[PDB]
Amino acid sequence: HHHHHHMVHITLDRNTANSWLIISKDRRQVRMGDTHQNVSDNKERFSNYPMVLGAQRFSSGKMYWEVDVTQKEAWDLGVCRDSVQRKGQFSLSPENGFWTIWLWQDSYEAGTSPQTTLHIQVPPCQIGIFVDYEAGVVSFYNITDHGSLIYTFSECVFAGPLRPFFNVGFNYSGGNAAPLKLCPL
Numbered sequence: 001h002h003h004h005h006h007m008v009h010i011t012l013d014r015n016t017a018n019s020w021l022i023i024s025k026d027r028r029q030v031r032m033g034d035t036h037q038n039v040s041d042n043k044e045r046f047s048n049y050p051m052v053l054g055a056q057r058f059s060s061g062k063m064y065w066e067v068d069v070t071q072k073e074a075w076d077l078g079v080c081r082d083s084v085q086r087k088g089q090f091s092l093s094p095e096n097g098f099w100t101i102w103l104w105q106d107s108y109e110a111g112t113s114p115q116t117t118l119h120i121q122v123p124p125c126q127i128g129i130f131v132d133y134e135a136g137v138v139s140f141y142n143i144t145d146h147g148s149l150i151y152t153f154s155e156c157v158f159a160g161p162l163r164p165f166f167n168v169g170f171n172y173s174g175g176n177a178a179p180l181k182l183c184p185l
């Protein structure tokens with residue numbers, strides 16, 4: 001891919017974070033804390049899962065960013081509508097306003113309904129995410145494997161402003177404490 005030149009500087013929005021997340025001072029890294037992080041509740045926070053949004057909102061254009069997933073066992077990445085549900089249980093699907101991929105139990109899957117099996121030969125340490133708003137496209141790239149394509153959602157019906165979406169995953173195993181990190185341009 002040659003999407004690198006649409007690079008955007010993403011930062012995380014503390015106000016949207018699940019109350020157990022710890023976001024770095026530079027707002028470029030997030031990890032699961034071992035307890036509640038002593039913040040007030042608000043209507044923006046994801047309550048049920050270790051999720052957080054980017055601060056940036058996109059309603060046009062082409063955008064590209066990269067995320068480091070080194071040594072994690074579980075995570076979700078992509079974009080979502082600004083108006084997605086925050087409270088209670090929900091599935092990650094385009095019908096619910098999410099365009100995502102994930103790692104879970106040693107398999108990679110795209111957040112379609114039902115989910116789609118991904119075929120990745122080189123487990124990624126960094127993921128590239130490309131959004132073309134006008135084209136209705138969200139694509140995922142394996143930066144560890146020379147930028148190879150992972151998955152493309154096409155004919156996307158965004159139906160509103162988009163935000164970068166992150167899930168650091170639970171850490172029941174003790175093997176998933178590592179952060180998600182936004183990689184430098």
Ligand SMILES: CC(=O)N1Cc2ccc(N)cc2C1
Pocket residue numbers: 020047048049
């Ligand atoms: C609401 C719910 O079922 N959750 C969210 C959450 C957050 C942190 C921890 N340690 C456990 C759980 C389970």
